[PDB]
Design an enzyme around this catalytic site. Structure first.
Site, mmCIF file in Angstrom:
data_model
loop_
_atom_site.group_PDB
_atom_site.id
_atom_site.type_symbol
_atom_site.label_atom_id
_atom_site.label_comp_id
_atom_site.label_asym_id
_atom_site.label_seq_id
_atom_site.Cartn_x
_atom_site.Cartn_y
_atom_site.Cartn_z
ATOM 1 N N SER A 98 11.642 -60.394 -10.210
ATOM 2 C CA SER A 98 10.411 -60.738 -9.516
ATOM 3 C C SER A 98 10.757 -61.271 -8.138
ATOM 4 C CB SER A 98 9.645 -61.803 -10.292
ATOM 5 O OG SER A 98 9.303 -61.339 -11.583
ATOM 6 N N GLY B 56 5.850 -63.215 -6.246
ATOM 7 C CA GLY B 56 6.033 -61.866 -6.766
ATOM 8 C C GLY B 56 5.361 -61.528 -8.083
ATOM 9 N N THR B 57 5.413 -60.239 -8.408
ATOM 10 C CA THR B 57 4.923 -59.662 -9.657
ATOM 11 C C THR B 57 5.579 -60.290 -10.890
ATOM 12 O OG1 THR B 57 4.105 -57.466 -8.997
ATOM 13 C CG2 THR B 57 5.353 -57.594 -11.046
ATOM 14 N N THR B 58 4.802 -60.462 -11.957
ATOM 15 C CA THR B 58 5.315 -61.055 -13.197
ATOM 16 C C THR B 58 6.174 -60.096 -14.034
ATOM 17 O OG1 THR B 58 4.669 -61.957 -15.379
ATOM 18 C CG2 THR B 58 2.967 -60.781 -14.144
#
Lengths: 242, 244, 233, 243, 250, 198, 244, 241
Positions: free
Chosen positions: B75, B30-32
């Site tokens: 995340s 996932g996105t940080t």
């Protein structure tokens, strides 16, 4: 094993698609819609000659303006017909009017996905999908004469003409060439008999074949074995010519 | 005999729950997202991947508020994060109803800790595919927490999770050493923006939208607020000045 | 590979993937194409319908949710019936209890949370339908994209279904044009029909084939079928 | 012939592998604990490893204050540890309300061990991968140590040790009580009992400690409390002047 | 969360074996040896206190437990299983008998109730059988002294004398050579200590051995005077000192 | 209210039940059969609350008939009366009890003896040579205490009921419109067509 | 979820047999033999104890012959623990019938009820069947002396003479050989012991390995009487037939 | 509660658990039914593996549901009791609410419905039982014969057989039953029933039981001697050729 309501890598529900295979093994059922009424026809297909033919009830009345034809595991249709009948009558009790065919079919199809093994959402108590498709035919003031095909998937399509069961792909091919917008009711009767005769294993007669229609005037009536025998006698004589 | 990774509540011969670790893989995918604890509050920030020009800017908000004083960022699987915050909000309402006082942050952490942990006790449920960073200001100061899919959580000076957690964690450790006596809330906002831009190096293929929120005793009256307008632009300008 | 982690939604794969959710997403891409686009004054849905035979009806793709909201479907139609009916109840509750038209963004949040539950518990399969939701609330026009994974995204334009990538490429290129179509409903529809044509590939779109929906400043959610779309053909 | 190792049912040898693998899980955090009795106190020591400089050290703890009188140290992963902690706190509050007196240490052990036994027998409940050590100065029994594991087993101890290097700590303490010929630490103040616990921990592990490396809990008459970093620092100065 | 284990985990195999019941008996075989001997004027149950550490206080852990003031129990197999069975058995003696009839259950009926609990864990959904065998010694006015064995299956058999666990086979042979229907209680305690010496590898004294009796009523251990018909418990646990005294002249 | 009488003679039980159904100021029906046949040799007469009366009788009838098909056997009058008693004794402590009093008249083919049971709505069962429910008993019990003999023929028993009915038609305030009389012997159950003008 | 571990006890094999039932019958063929014989003037029940030691108490023991009623008894072959569950619900049913009708329950009705309970575990619930077979001996005023059998499938049939448990095939042939309709109880007792003695898996049939019961009509009373033979009584009746 | 889906579809469209329920019916002892002009006759076979049964107390294969309808079966004996009990309760309930006994068609429809229900409910297997249901509708003198099967499908028959070797006896009835002229007498209708069973059963007085249902609740089960007279007369017909 593997869950009941489960998706295949191709994006289809196993049980629903496997149920579609059970329907293809059933007896053929044909519908035709015209502006003079809708016609339903079925193949009896008795397992033994000792079977009393007129006990095979594969055409059933839902309400005075709605009829039903079945194909596949016909025993599964009993609770579907029971729900269809209760829904139709309840609408009349609640609204002092006839249930719309399109709203009746939609109600039957709501049952189709109520299968599973767990509780998340509403509550779906049923181990498997129905093993039977239905041709639903009727009339209402709003949309006139209508023919519906109700699959165990929960989806329903309106048809001008539809055939279901063992000889359905052959039957649908023939219904494509034959159907037009200004067919009379008598033509639709003879047409049903013609396609049934073709796709049946047995030689079609008044005992192994049943007809029924639905009109605005007379409602839904199942044809008796004398009235059908005359139409078969009428169809033979027209095909003998040219 | 193997197959210990096929069911949730199953211990493998080495004592691990492999399904939880598979959830961690979804988190790493996932996105940080990050969190900085400052001398009177907390700051939260997240990367938002701009997949298409068709995404409306400043609209697909990922940072969530719990009650009026707790901010949550995550995340991994976004819907799972939302589910956890829905439980968080119910749990917070439950606390305030009985005790009048708004839920203390350590108290809130355990509520989520226990709920996530519960999803590792049974084979009939799936673990959460999210790592959550959350915190706020209570009776006795600022608190920052990060919660793992196993139900593990600790208190943090700085927290980071997702695709660019490495770069973030190194950058955070520089601040802890260089600013021992605390960092100011105003500074931590700008500083958070720099971390997201630097952690974007891992997921650098697509363009991104920065999203910051803060909870400070002297800057927001101890309430959770998003960063908007001039202060948000100032942070983007600051991050861009130290990206060259 | 695949074999083992395939079995139910409650199971994670070694890489961290949820295969049952993925197979559900596949039913959408195999569904018929539908397009969504919005300006600042209006929001438009454009749907291509699919028939089983030339003797069958074109099964409806657009469902009304309230006087200010509605959605288009692609995938399993019964699953869209369950979800739209849920959204109808949520719009209805907001009207009855709070005398408040339900915000389009908030409607998305509720669909997200309902789909998520079907991805974390045993027995329940994920939903097999993708949804495009248009609306005009107290903050103007809105378009949302629903995926059965639970992921909802607010967008200017988008497309889902078979060959939808052509429409999304077209809309991405034409972003600055259609967003400015303010106070002209017919020029938004015109743009939508040109967007759906980038995904046709096979057939020519006819009068009983195309479905259109619109909502806006003074326009309540309305669906157009038959001769009503003959001018956009 | 395949799944008898996934759920809590017997194998052909009469064993429960899920319970055995739960014991394996208790060593995951690579931490050693020990507990000792004084004249009128009970002390627990646990290793405190903070590998990350981003963590807030004050929150990293495996010692819990269950009630006013009962304390608990856990060997095992923290999510399971907190699960047990919250349960023990709930049970301790419920006991008091129902029976009009504070739950004894040994009874809370029995209760938690009985709950552990259930997960050992019922298939849907997984065992917790934790060993729970309960300590107090009971009003009837005096200084007390009771320890429960994922098997549902529990027993009282003169002293105890838990963790990867359990056996080295145990034999070390065994050797002290052979020489002293009594079953406790003959010391009036709890301070020197804490000093004993650290000294005998060091000698068994072969590693020196600083204030941030240890975690200390003390149970006295009517009270259980944990030591601060500076409390431990003061205690570490005293052992340095001994050698 | 839902307990979806509403099906049996113990099922008949093609050979007719109930696998999980067999495996539970295997667990009992690994267990420490315990025995039971019935005399004319009493009954004795005995076992070894196998210690898991010299730091552990074996006094806190009882392998012999009072169920009712005239009924005691001992076991071989899984310790934790036994403990919870004792709790359940103590309660069922109250709820099923003492609260209905105002007196404690006769040995055969309490045993019957214990056996019912273990049978249920043989058939009920989502459970494994108990990995213990029990030896229950008791007295009641109309039956006198009795001794029963209870197996993981829920089966029970009355014994004149028997042993279960590690060295049961060798112990049952030792008992067949020494038992007669004229034994006085003090004689039965003597044999009990002789039998156990063959099982124990380590130290053999009053601290490593747990032994209790069912004999005469103990007015001293009652706790109160005043009721003539209340005469005291027949279950007496022997102290470490009492055992050693009989071991010096053994 | 209703007349419900019963008399056991040498080799039969005779049940007489009033024919009137009255609600308010109107006699609605004058030919009512206040009885149900439970089995070939067991008859039950009933009186009480307007609705409860027929609902209870038909419920008992269904249960006895069900037993007869399952077991291919006929229950003794004693067994049937114990079943009815227990049903009433259950309902008396329910939310809405059945307010029905019954007489059970049967012939035990096993014992070769007639049997009459009186059971009230509380579930008070008792076997009697002669019985009545309601205000009828206040007249008939003493009349029978005098005229009854335990060895009378069925014909003598009918003359004795005639004397009971005539007493009630003289001294009771309500016009109960006469009685339907039924005989229960070894040959089953039959109705006496002429009693209104016997 | 749980699916993986479900044995599916209540399903059909491709042949149309019920797996679990068939395997339960397989278990019963290992249980000690039990024989019932009906005479003109009564019924005999004889059972083989199977597992016995020198130190097994017999005076207190009751493992194969149980009293259900004053007029009905049973011989058990299979799992004793399972059997006691069923014996107790049958003892309750008999008392319910006596409470409802003031008459002792006809033998068949009690037999049908137990057979119906067994049938349930065969069709629904997902639980294992009862590994027990019964021989019922009883008297009622409808059919007089009756002898029935019931097994894990929930099926029952009526017999003049029958055996359950081990070596039934061998024992049934021997009974069919020597049984006649005009038999007297004392002759049936002899038949019962002579049959068991030839089908035993032991050296010689002794008293401590047997359970014996008769249902007779009071020799001077004129009413029905049961007699679960005591150890000393079996020892005597064994010397009479010439077995010692 | 146990809700596992035991009756499910397979790739080719079969419910294997329903399929296997028929295999149990094929295993069951043979049952036959033929309808005359004014009667219906149900014939069943007895197993002769055990030559020491008590026929007084053994539950006979033909059960009465009400006084005017009878039901025989092939398959698992234990399962059939459950269907019979449910049919008997329904029969009494129909008399209670409709004030009229059940029509054979109705009672059949009910039993078939129960069987169908057990094919799509969780935690149950279907009944391993096919039934023959015969009798006369109230006030009616026309014979009725129906068959149900584990799937839940029901239908009426002039003549039908179920159970082991039912293929052989159905083959017999297909050429020996004239629809134009059904057996006019009770006598000749019983004659045809025994003839068809003797194809499967073997020389046995016992081994064949007959039950004759006539209009207005006139049901009688024939003795060994009566059936034996038909057997003695039928066997003497073959020897003439």
């Amino acid at each position: 094993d593997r869950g009941v309501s489960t998706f295949s890598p191709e994006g289809r529900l196993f049980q629903v698609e496997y149920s579609l295979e059970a329907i293809k093994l059933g007896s053929t059922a044909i519908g035709i819609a015209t502006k003079e009424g809708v016609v339903l026809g079925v193949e009896k297909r008795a397992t033994s000659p000792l079977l009393e033919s007129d006990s095979i009830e594969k055409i059933v009345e839902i309400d005075r303006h709605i009829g039903c034809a079945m194909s596949g595991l016909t025993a599964d249709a009993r609770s579907m017909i029971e729900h269809a009948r209760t829904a139709a009558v309840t609408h009349n009790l609640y609204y002092d009017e006839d249930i719309n065919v399109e709203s009746l079919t939609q109600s039957v199809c709501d049952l189709a996905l109520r299968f599973g093994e767990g509780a998340s959402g509403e509550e779906r108590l049923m181990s498997r999908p129905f093993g039977v498709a239905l041709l639903i035919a009727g009339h209402d003031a709003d949309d006139g004469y209508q023919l519906f095909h109700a699959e165990p998937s929960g989806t329903f399509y309106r048809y001008n003409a539809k055939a279901i069961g063992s000889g359905s792909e052959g039957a649908q091919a023939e219904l494509l060439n034959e159907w037009h917008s200004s067919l009379t009711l008598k033509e639709a009767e003879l047409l049903v008999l013609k396609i049934l005769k073709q796709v049946m294993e047995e030689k079609l007669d008044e005992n192994n074949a049943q007809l029924s229609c639905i009109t605005k005037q007379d409602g839904f009536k199942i044809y008796d074995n004398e009235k059908t025998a005359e139409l078969i006698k009428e169809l033979k004589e027209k095909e003998a010519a040219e | 005999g193997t197959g210990y990774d096929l069911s949730n509540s199953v211990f493998s011969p080495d004592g691990r729950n492999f399904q939880v670790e598979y959830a961690v893989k979804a988190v790493e995918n996932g996105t940080t997202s990050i969190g900085i604890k400052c001398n009177d509050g907390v700051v939260f920030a997240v990367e938002k991947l701009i997949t298409s020009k068709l995404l409306v800017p400043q609209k697909n908000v990922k940072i969530q508020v719990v009650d009026r004083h707790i901010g949550c960022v995550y995340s991994g699987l976004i819907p799972d994060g939302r589910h956890l915050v829905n439980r968080g909000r119910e749990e917070a309402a439950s606390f305030k109803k009985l005790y009048k006082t708004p839920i203390p942050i350590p108290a809130f952490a355990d509520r989520l800790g226990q709920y996530v942990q519960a999803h590792t006790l049974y084979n009939s449920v799936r673990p959460f595919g999210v790592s959550t960073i959350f915190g706020g200001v209570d009776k006795n100061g600022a608190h920052l927490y990060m919660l793992e899919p196993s139900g593990s959580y600790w208190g943090y000076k700085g927290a980071a999770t997702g695709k660019g957690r490495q770069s973030a964690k190194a950058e955070l450790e520089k601040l802890v050493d260089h600013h021992p006596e605390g960092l100011s809330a105003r500074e931590a906002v700008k500083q958070a923006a720099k971390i997201i831009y630097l952690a974007h190096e891992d997921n650098k293929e697509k363009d991104f939208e920065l999203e910051i929120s803060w909870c400070s005793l002297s800057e927001t009256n101890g309430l959770h607020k998003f960063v908007k307008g001039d202060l948000l632009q100032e942070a983007i300008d600051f991050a861009q000045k130290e990206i060259n | 590979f695949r074999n083992n982690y395939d079995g139910d939604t409650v199971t994670f794969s070694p890489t961290g993937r949820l295969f049952q959710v993925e197979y559900a997403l596949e039913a959408i891409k195999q569904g018929s194409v539908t397009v969504g686009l919005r300006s600042n004054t209006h929001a438009v849905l454009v749907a291509l319908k699919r028939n089983a035979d030339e003797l069958s009806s074109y099964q409806k793709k657009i469902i009304k949710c309230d006087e200010h909201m509605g959605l288009s479907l692609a995938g399993l139609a019964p699953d869209a019936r369950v979800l739209s009916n849920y959204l109808r109840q949520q719009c209805n509750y907001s009207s009855l209890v709070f005398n408040r038209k339900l915000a389009v963004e908030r409607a998305g949040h509720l669909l997200c949370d309902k789909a998520q539950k079907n991805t974390q518990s045993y027995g329940g399969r994920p939903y097999g339908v993708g949804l495009l939701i248009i609306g005009y609330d107290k903050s103007g026009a809105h378009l949302l994209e629903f995926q059965p994974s639970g992921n909802v995204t607010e967008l200017y334009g988008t497309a889902i279904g078979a060959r939808s990538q052509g429409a999304k490429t077209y809309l991405e290129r034409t972003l600055d044009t259609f967003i400015k179509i303010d106070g002209n409903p017919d020029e938004l529809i015109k743009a939508g029909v040109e967007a759906i044509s980038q995904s046709l590939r096979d057939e020519s779109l006819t009068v009983d084939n195309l479905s259109i929906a619109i909502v806006g400043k003074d326009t309540p959610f309305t669906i157009y079928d038959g001769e009503a779309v003959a001018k956009y053909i | 012939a395949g799944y008898d190792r996934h759920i809590t049912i017997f194998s052909p040898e009469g064993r429960l592998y899920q319970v055995e693998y739960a014991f394996k899980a208790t060593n995951q955090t690579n931490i050693n604990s020990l507990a000792v009795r004084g004249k009128d106190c009970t002390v627990v020591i646990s290793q405190k490893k903070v590998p990350d400089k981003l963590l807030d050290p004050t929150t990293v703890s495996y010692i819990f204050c269950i009630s006013r009188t009962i304390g608990m140290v856990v060997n095992g992963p923290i999510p399971d540890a907190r699960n047990a902690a919250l349960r023990a706190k709930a049970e301790a509050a419920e006991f008091r309300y129902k029976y009009g007196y504070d739950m004894p240490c040994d009874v809370l052990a029995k209760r938690m061990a009985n709950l552990s036994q259930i997960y050992t027998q019922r298939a849907y409940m997984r065992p917790l991968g934790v060993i729970l050590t309960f300590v107090s100065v009971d009003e009837e029994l005096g200084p007390s140590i009771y320890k429960t594991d994922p098997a549902g087993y529990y027993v009282g101890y003169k002293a105890t040790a838990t963790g990867p290097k359990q056996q080295e700590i145990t034999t070390n303490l065994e050797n002290h009580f052979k020489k002293s010929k009594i079953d406790h630490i003959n010391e009036e103040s709890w301070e020197k009992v804490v000093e004993f616990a650290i000294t005998h921990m060091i000698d068994a592990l072969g590693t020196e400690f600083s204030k941030n490396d240890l975690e200390v809990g003390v149970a006295t008459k009517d009270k259980f409390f944990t030591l601060s970093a500076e409390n431990i620092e003061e205690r570490l100065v005293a052992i340095a002047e001994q050698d | 969360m839902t307990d979806r284990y509403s099906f049996s985990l113990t099922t008949f195999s093609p050979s007719g074996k109930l696998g999980q019941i067999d495996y539970a008996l295997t667990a009992v075989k690994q267990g420490v040896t315990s025995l039971g001997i019935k005399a004319t004027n009493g009954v004795v149950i005995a076992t070894e206190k196998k210690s898991s550490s010299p730091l552990a206080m074996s006094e806190t852990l009882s392998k012999v437990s009072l169920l009712t003031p005239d009924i005691g129990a001992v076991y071989s197999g899984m310790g934790p299983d036994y403990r919870v069975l004792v709790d359940k058995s103590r309660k069922v003696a109250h709820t099923s008998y003492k609260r209905i009839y105002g007196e404690y259950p006769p040995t055969k009926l309490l045993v019957s109730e214990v056996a019912k609990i273990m049978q249920e864990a043989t058939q009920s959904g989502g459970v494994r059988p108990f990995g213990v065998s029990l030896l229950i010694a008791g007295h009641d006015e109309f039956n006198g002294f009795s001794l029963y064995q209870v197996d993981p299956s829920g089966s029970y058999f009355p014994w004149k004398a028997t042993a279960i666990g590690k060295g049961s086979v060798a112990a049952k042979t030792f008992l067949e050579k020494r038992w007669n229907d004229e034994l006085e209680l003090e004689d039965a305690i003597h044999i009990a200590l002789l039998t156990l010496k063959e099982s124990v590898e380590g130290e053999f004294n009053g601290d490593t051995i747990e032994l209790a009796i069912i004999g005469d009523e103990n007015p001293d251990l009652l706790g109160y005077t005043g009721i003539p018909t209340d005469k005291g418990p027949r279950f007496r646990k022997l102290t470490s000192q009492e055992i050693n005294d009989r071991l010096e002249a053994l | 209210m209703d007349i419900i009488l019963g008399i056991r003679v040498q080799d039969s039980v005779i049940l007489a039940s009033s024919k009137a159904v009255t609600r308010g100021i109107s006699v609605l029906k004058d030919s009512d059969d206040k009885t149900r046949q439970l089995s070939p040799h067991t008859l039950m007469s009933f009186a009480g609350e307007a609705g409860d009366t027929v609902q209870f009788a038909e419920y008992i009838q269904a249960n006895i008939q069900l037993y007869s098909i399952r077991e291919d056997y006929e229950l003794s009058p004693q067994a049937v009366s114990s079943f009815v008693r227990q049903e009433l004794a259950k309902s008396i402590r329910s939310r809405r009890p059945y307010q029905v009093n019954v007489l059970i008249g049967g012939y035990d083919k096993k014992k070769n003896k007639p049997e009459l049971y009186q059971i009230d709505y509380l579930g008070t069962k008792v076997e009697l040579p002669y019985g009545a429910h309601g205000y009828s008993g206040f007249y008939t019990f003493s009349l029978l205490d005098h005229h009854y003999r335990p060895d009378m023929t069925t014909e003598e028993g009918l003359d004795l009921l005639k004397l009971c009915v005539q007493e009630l038609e003289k001294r009771m305030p309500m016009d109960f419109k006469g009685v339907i009389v039924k005989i229960v012997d070894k040959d089953g159950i039959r109705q006496v067509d002429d009693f209104q003008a016997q | 979820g749980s699916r993986r571990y479900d044995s599916r006890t209540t399903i059909f094999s491709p042949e149309g047999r019920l797996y679990q039932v068939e395997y339960a019958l397989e278990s019963i063929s290992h249980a000690g033999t039990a024989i019932g014989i009906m005479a003109s003037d009564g019924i005999v029940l004889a059972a083989e104890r199977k597992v016995t030691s020198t130190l097994l108490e017999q005076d207190t023991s009751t493992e194969k012959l149980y009293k259900l009623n004053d007029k009905i008894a049973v011989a058990v072959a299979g799992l004793t623990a399972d059997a006691e569950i069923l014996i107790n619900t049958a003892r309750i049913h008999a008392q319910n019938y006596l409470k409802t009708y003031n008459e002792d329950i006809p033998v068949e009705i009690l037999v049908r009820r137990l057979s119906d309970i067994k049938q349930g575990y065969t069709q629904h619930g997902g639980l294992r069947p009862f590994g027990v077979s019964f021989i019922y001996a009883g008297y009622d005023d409808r059919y007089g002396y009756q002898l029935y059998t019931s097994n894990p499938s929930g099926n029952y049939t009526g017999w003049k003479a029958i055996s359950v448990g081990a070596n039934t095939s061998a024992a049934q042939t021997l009974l069919q050989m020597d049984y006649k309709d005009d038999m007297k109880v004392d002759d049936a007792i002899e038949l019962a012991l002579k049959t068991l003695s030839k089908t035993t898996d032991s050296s010689a049939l002794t008293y401590d390995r047997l359970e014996f019961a008769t249902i007779r009509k009071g020799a001077n009373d004129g009413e029905v009487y049961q007699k679960i033979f005591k150890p000393q009584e079996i020892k005597d009746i064994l010397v009479k037939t010439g077995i010692t | 509660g146990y809700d596992r889906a035991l009756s499910i579809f397979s790739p080719d469209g079969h419910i294997f658990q329903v399929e296997y329920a028929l295999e149990a019916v094929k295993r069951g002892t043979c049952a036959v039914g033929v309808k005359g002009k004014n009667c219906v006759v149900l014939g069943c076979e007895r197993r002769s593996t055990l030559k020491l049964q008590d026929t007084r107390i053994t539950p006979s294969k033909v059960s009465k549901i009400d006084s005017h309808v009878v039901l025989s079966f092939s398959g698992l004996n234990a399962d059939s009791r459950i269907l019979i009990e449910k049919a008997r309760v329904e029969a009494q309930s129909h008399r209670l609410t409709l004030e009229d006994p059940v029509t054979v068609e109705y009672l059949t429809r009910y039993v078939a419905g129960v069987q169908q229900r057990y094919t799509q409910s969780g935690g149950v297997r279907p009944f391993g039982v096919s039934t023959l249901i015969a009798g006369f509708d109230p006030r009616d003198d026309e014979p009725k014969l129906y068959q149900t099967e584990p799937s839940g499908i029901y239908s009426s028959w002039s003549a039908q057989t179920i159970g082991r070797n039912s293929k052989t006896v159905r083959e017999f009835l297909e050429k020996n039953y004239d629809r134009k002229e059904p057996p006019a007498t009770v006598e000749e209708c019983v004659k045809l029933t025994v003839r068809s069973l003797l194809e499967v059963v073997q020389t046995g007085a016992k081994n064949i039981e007959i039950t004759v249902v006539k209009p207005d609740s006139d049901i009688v089960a024939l003795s060994s001697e009566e059936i034996n007279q038909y057997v003695t007369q039928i066997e003497q017909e073959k020897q003439e050729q």
